[PDB]
Amino acid sequence: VTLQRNITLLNGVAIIVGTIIGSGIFVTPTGVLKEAGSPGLALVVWAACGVFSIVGALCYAELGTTISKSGGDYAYMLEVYGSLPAFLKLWIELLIIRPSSQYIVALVFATYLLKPLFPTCPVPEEAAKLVACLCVLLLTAVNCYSVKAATRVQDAFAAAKLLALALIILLGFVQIGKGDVSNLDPNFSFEGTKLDVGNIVLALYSGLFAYGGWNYLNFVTEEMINPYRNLPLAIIISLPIVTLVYVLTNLAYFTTLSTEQMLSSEAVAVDFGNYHLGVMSWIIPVFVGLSCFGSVNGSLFTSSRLFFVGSREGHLPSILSMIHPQLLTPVPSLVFTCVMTLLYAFSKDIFSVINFFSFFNWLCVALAIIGMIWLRHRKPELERPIKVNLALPVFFILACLFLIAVSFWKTPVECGIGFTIILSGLPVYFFGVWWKNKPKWLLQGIFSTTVLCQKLMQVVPQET
Amino acid sequence: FTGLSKEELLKVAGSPGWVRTRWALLLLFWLGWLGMLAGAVVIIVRAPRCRELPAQKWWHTGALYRIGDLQAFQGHGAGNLAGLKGRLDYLSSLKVKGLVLGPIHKNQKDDVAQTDLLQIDPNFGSKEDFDSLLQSAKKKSIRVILDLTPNYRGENSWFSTQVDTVATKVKDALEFWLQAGVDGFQVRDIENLKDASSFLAEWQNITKGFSEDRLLIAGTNSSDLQQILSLLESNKDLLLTSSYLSDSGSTGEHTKSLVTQYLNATGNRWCSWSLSQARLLTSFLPAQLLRLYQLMLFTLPGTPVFSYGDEIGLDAAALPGQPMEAPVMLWDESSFPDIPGAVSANMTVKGQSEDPGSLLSLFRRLSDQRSKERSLLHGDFHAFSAGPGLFSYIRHWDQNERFLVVLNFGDVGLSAGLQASDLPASASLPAKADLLLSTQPGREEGSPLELERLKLEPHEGLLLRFPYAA
Ligand SMILES: CCCCCCCCCCCCCCCCCC(=O)OC[C@H](COP(=O)(O)O)OC(=O)CCCCCCCCCCCCCCCCC
Ligand SMILES: CC(C)CCC[C@H](C)[C@H]1CC[C@H]2[C@H]3CC=C4C[C@@H](OC(=O)CCC(=O)O)CC[C@@]4(C)[C@@H]3CC[C@@]12C
Ligand SMILES: CC(C)CCC[C@H](C)[C@H]1CC[C@H]2[C@H]3CC=C4C[C@@H](OC(=O)CCC(=O)O)CC[C@@]4(C)[C@@H]3CC[C@@]12C
Ligand SMILES: *[C@@H]1O[C@H](CO)[C@@H](O[C@@H]2O[C@H](CO)[C@@H](O)[C@H](O)[C@H]2NC(C)=O)[C@H](O)[C@H]1NC(C)=O
Ligand SMILES: *[C@@H]1O[C@H](CO)[C@@H](O[C@@H]2O[C@H](CO)[C@@H](O)[C@H](O)[C@H]2NC(C)=O)[C@H](O)[C@H]1NC(C)=O
Ligand SMILES: *[C@@H]1O[C@H](CO)[C@@H](O[C@@H]2O[C@H](CO)[C@@H](O)[C@H](O)[C@H]2NC(C)=O)[C@H](O)[C@H]1NC(C)=O
Ligand SMILES: *[C@@H]1O[C@H](CO)[C@@H](O[C@@H]2O[C@H](CO)[C@@H](O)[C@H](O)[C@H]2NC(C)=O)[C@H](O)[C@H]1NC(C)=O
Ligand SMILES: N[C@@H](Cc1cc(I)c(O)c(I)c1)C(=O)O
C-alpha cells in the first residue's frame, strides 16, 4: 500500500504557477512603488527579484534530484543537519507557518468574492470568516476523496488565474495602442535612489515577497511520474513564465493610473477594472477570488504530504502516515491540516505573522543550500543526474544572509519573539522523540488512541 | 508500526456497528457544512450593503488658486505666461486643483470699441504659449480658469455706459475660449452689471452646454445674505465667491451663525468658502488668526478659494511702496529690489519650506488631507453647541473615519465643554479620539485624547479624528 505516482509534468507546472500567482500581483505594486518612487525603477526591481528566484529554484532542483525523498526542505535538512535541527523546522511549520498562510489566503478569497456587493464600504467580518471556513472545509474533503480530483481542481484554477492575468495584459495593450503615453517614455521622475541605505533593497524585499513559493514541488516529490526528469523540467518551465507575466502586468498598470492614483489605492486591479470596464467591472474581484481559491488547494496538498513524511521517521505520532486503502489518500494527515488551519479563525489579528513567515522562509532556504554545499564534498559518491556549476549557490547563499539581515533589521522586536517561539520546541522533542521507553500509563494510551482513530477512519500502515 | 496491520483491521473494522457510525459521521459533516453556508447567507442579507458615491466633479476635490496680477507673481520683466510654466511644480506641491488666471485680454481703458475679449495682451505672451501652458498643466493635472471681466483697469469694471455690447462680447468670448480648451470662467464685480441675474443664467446655460466638466465663478463685494440668495434663485450650479464671511469677527458665536445660516438658507448645496473675491486673508485678519481660518476653510462643506500668497501669510501692510491690490510674491530673500533688507528669512517661500511649524507647512498637510479622505470630500456636516467662543463641528460620510474640528476664536483660555446630546446615532462622538494636528506648537501628535478634560489655549484649533464604531 504505497501512495502513488500520478503527477505528470502538466500537473506539476500548475502546483508551482498557481501557488506563486496569488494576491501579490493584485496588491504589492502599491508597496514597491511607494518605497521606490519611480515607475522605471519598479519595472527593473520586478526583474531583479525574478532572476534571483530563478537561481534559487535551479539550486533547489539540484538538491531535489540529489536527495530524492519527499517532504523537501525537511528531508534535505534531516540528511544533513540531523534529527534535532529537522524537528526544529517541522515544529514551526505545523504550529504557525503553514496554518496561517492558508487561513490568510482563504480570507483574501472571501473578502474579494463578496467585493461586488460592497464597494464604497467594506465586507463584514463574521460573513467573511464563514466563507473562509467553507473554502477550507470543502477542499479538504475534495483532497480526501481522491488525488486525481485534487490535481484537476488545481489544473482548472491555475489556468483560470492565467486567463485573468492575460485579461489585464490585453486591457493594457489597448490603452498602449490608444496613444495615451504619459508614462514609460519621459520616466524616472523621482529615481528614489538612496535615503541612507534603504531605498532599493526595500523594493527588492517587497518584490521578493511577490515571487514566493517556488519550492512546493519539492514537497510533493516521491509522487511525481519520473521525478528524475520532470522535477527540474517543471521548475524550468514554470519560473520565467511567471517572470515575464509579472513584468507585463505591472507595465499594464502604469498605462491606466498615474503614480498618485496607484499610491493611495488599496487594490490596483480594482481601480484598473473601474477605469477600463465600468459595467461588467465585477469580473476582476471575482477572478482575484478564484486566484486565491487555487492556492489553498495547492497548499493543503503539500502540507498534508509534509506532515505525512515527518511521521515516517518518528518525529510525529504514528496515526499520521497511515494511508486509507481504496482511494489511497493520507486521510488523518489532511484532517489534521484542516483542523489546525481552522484553529486560526479565533485570532482577531492574523496578518501579524507575515514578517516571521518571510524571515523563517529565507533562513531555512539559506540552511538548505549551506547543507547542499556541505554535503557535496562530504559524500561525493551519490548519483547526481543534474549537476550545477558552483557560485550560483554562493551568490544565492550570501544574498540569503543579506535578506536575513534585512528581515532582522526592520522589526527586531517581533523577530526575537519568533526566535523564542522557534526555541519553544525543545521540551516537546525531549518528551516525545528523545525520551525512549515511555511508561505504560502512556504507551497503552498512545496505542489505544491510534487504534480508535484507525477504526474511525479505516486506515492501514504504509507497507509496500 | 504503532497499531494494527491491514488484515486485523479488515477483520475488526468491517462489521455493522462500525460502518453505520462512520456514515452517520459523514451525514453530520455534510449537515454542518450547509448549516454554516446558511448562517453566512443569513448574515449577509441582514447587513448594510453600501451608500452611494455622489458623482463628484473636478472642483469638488480640492482648492482653487487665484492669481490676480501676473507681473507680481514672479517679478519684473519675466512677468509673462511662459514664466508661470516654470512654477507649476510649486502649485502641484500645494495640491491645488485649479488655477484662476488673471484677465489677460487687450483692454486699454473705458473705450468699449477697442476692448477685444479674444485678443491676448502682447505683454503677457502669445496664443501658442498659452496653449503650451494649458497642456503642461493638463499633464500636471491642474485646470486653468480664465477671468473675463472686461474693464480690469478702470474704476467701473463693467463699462458704465450701455450694457448690450459688453454682455454680447462676454457671451461671444465663452464659445471661443472654450474651443481653445479652457476649463471654466470667472466674472468679477457682478454688482456693477445691469440685470446680472438674467445674464449669469445665459452664460451658465452656455458653459454647461459645452460639457458638464465646465465651471463658472461669479464674484461680488456684497456681504448681504439676502442679496446673495437672490443671485441663486434660478442659478443653482453657480460658484459665488463674495465678502459674506469676513466683515467682522473677533467672536466665534457669530461665525458659527453665519455658516449655519448660509447652509440652512441654501438647502445644503455646494458652495464656495472664501473671505473675498480678490483680496488676501491679511486684509481682514490679524497675523494671530491666519491659521485658525486656514483650518476652517479646508474642512467646511464646499470649495475653498485662495489668492496667491495666502499659504505664506503674505502681507502688503508690512513693506511700503506697494499697491494694495497686487503685492509682490516673496520667493527668495533677494526678491524685493527696493529697500534692500526689510524682507526677513521667515517671510519667503524658501524660508518656510523646511520649518515644520510654519504656515506653508500647515497648508500642505491640510491640502493633503482634504483631497484624499472621503469624509472631508463629500461627507455630511453637523455643528453642535459648545462654550462661549467655540466653533465645533463634525464631518461624517458613511463609514470612513469621522472628523471633529474644534476652533477657539477667543483670546482667553477656557475648557471645551463638548455637550453634543443631539448628534445622530451614526455619528455620536466617543470617549476617546485621536489628534491629527494642531494650529499652535506645544502638543503631541498621534495620541488618543479624551473629550471631557480637553482644554484649549488662546487662538487654537484642533483636528481630532475617530473611526466608525458603535
Ligand atoms: C481531531 C483528531 C484527528 C486525528 C488526526 C491526528 C491528530 C493527532 C496529531 C497529533 C500531533 C501532535 C504533534 C506534537 C506531538 C509531539 C511529538 C511527539 O510526541 O513524538 C511522536 C511520538 C511517537 O509515538 P509513536 O506514535 O509511538 O511513534 O508520539 C508521542 O510521544 C505521543 C505522546 C504525545 C502526544 C501529544 C498529542 C497532543 C494532542 C492529542 C490529540 C488526540 C486526538 C485524538 C483523536 C481521537 C479522539 C477520540
Ligand atoms: C468559489 C466556488 C464558487 C468555486 C467552486 C470550485 C468548483 C467549481 C467546485 C465545484 C465542484 C467541485 C469538485 C467536486 C468533485 C469532482 C470529481 C472529479 O472527478 C473524479 O472524481 C475523478 C474520477 C476518477 O477517479 O477517475 C472532477 C472534479 C471535481 C473535484 C470538482 C471540481 C470543481 C469543485 C472543486
Ligand atoms: C474530528 C475528527 C476526529 C473526525 C474524523 C472523522 C472523519 C472526518 C469521518 C467523516 C466520515 C468518515 C468516513 C466515511 C466513509 C469512509 C469509507 C470510504 O468509502 C469507501 O471506501 C469506498 C471505496 C471507494 O470509493 O473506492 C469513504 C471515505 C471514508 C473513509 C470517510 C473518511 C472520513 C470519516 C472517517
Ligand atoms: C437655456 O436657456 C433657454 C432659454 O434661456 C432654454 O430654452 C427655451 O427658451 C424658451 C424661451 O427663450 C422657452 O420658452 C423654452 O421653454 C425653453 N426650453 C425649455 C425650457 O426646454 C433652455 O432650456 C436652457 N437650456 C437648458 C439645458 O435648460
Ligand atoms: C461694493 O462697491 C461699491 C463701490 O465701492 C460700493 O458703492 C457703490 O458704488 C456704486 C458706484 O460704483 C454706486 O452706484 C452705488 O450706489 C454704491 N452703493 C451704495 C449702497 O450706495 C458698494 O456699496 C459696495 N458694496 C457693499 C455691500 O459695500
Ligand atoms: C432654518 O432656519 C430657521 C431659522 O433660522 C430654523 O428655525 C425655524 O424657523 C421657522 C420659521 O422661520 C419656524 O416655524 C420653526 O419653528 C423654526 N424651528 C426651530 C427648530 O427653531 C429652521 O429650523 C432651519 N431649518 C432647518 C431645516 O433646521
Ligand atoms: C520672523 O522672525 C522675527 C524674529 O523673531 C520676528 O520678529 C519678532 O516679532 C515678534 C512679534 O511679531 C516680537 O515679539 C519679537 O520680539 C520679534 N523678534 C525680534 C528679534 O525682534 C518676525 O515677526 C517674524 N516674521 C513674521 C512675519 O512674523
Ligand atoms: N507569492 C505568493 C505568496 C506566497 C509566498 C510564499 I514564502 C509561499 O511559500 C507561497 I506557497 C506563496 C503570492 O503571490 O501570494
Describe this entry's structure for a reader.
- The PDB classes it as membrane protein.
- Keywords: LAT1-4F2hc, membrane protein.
- The assembly is dimeric.
- The entry is titled "Overall structure of the LAT1-4F2hc bound with 3,5-diiodo-L-tyrosine".
- Chain A is Large neutral amino acids transporter small subunit 1.
- The complex is a heterodimer of chains A (464) and B (470).
- By secondary structure, chain A is mostly helical.
- Chain A is built from 19 helices and no strands.
- Chain A is globular, with a radius of gyration of 23 Å.
- Chain B is α/β, with parallel strands linked by helices and 470 residues long.
- Chain B is 30% helix and 16% strand.
- Chain B contains 14 helices and 18 strands.
- In chain B, the strands form 6 sheets. A 5-stranded parallel β-sheet of chain B has the order 2-5-6-7-8, with helices on one face. Chain B has a 4-stranded antiparallel β-sheet with strand order 11-12-13-18.
- In chain B, α7 runs parallel beside α8.
- The relative contact order of chain B is 0.08.
- The interface between A and B is medium-sized, with 38 and 32 residues.
- Bound molecules: 1,2-diacyl-glycerol-3-SN-phosphate (3PH), cholesterol hemisuccinate (2 copies), a molecule of 2 linked components (NAG-NAG) (4 copies) and 3,5-diiodotyrosine.
- The site of one cholesterol hemisuccinate (Y01) has 7 residues of chain A, from α8.
In brief, what are we looking at here?
The complex is a heterodimer of chains A (464) and B (470). Chain A has 464 residues and is mainly α.
Written as H for each helix and E for each strand, in order along the chain, the element string of chain A is HHHHHHHHHHHHHHHHHHH
How is the biggest beta sheet of chain A arranged? none
Unique ligands:
1,2-diacyl-glycerol-3-SN-phosphate, cholesterol hemisuccinate, a molecule of 2 linked components (NAG-NAG), 3,5-diiodotyrosine
Radius of gyration of CA atoms of chain A, rounded to a whole number: 23 Å
Helix/strand/pairing class of chain B, anyone? alpha/beta
Protein name (chain A): Large neutral amino acids transporter small subunit 1
Pfam family, one (chain A): AA_permease_2
GO biological process, one term (chain A): positive regulation of glial cell proliferation
GO cellular component, one term (chain A): cytosol
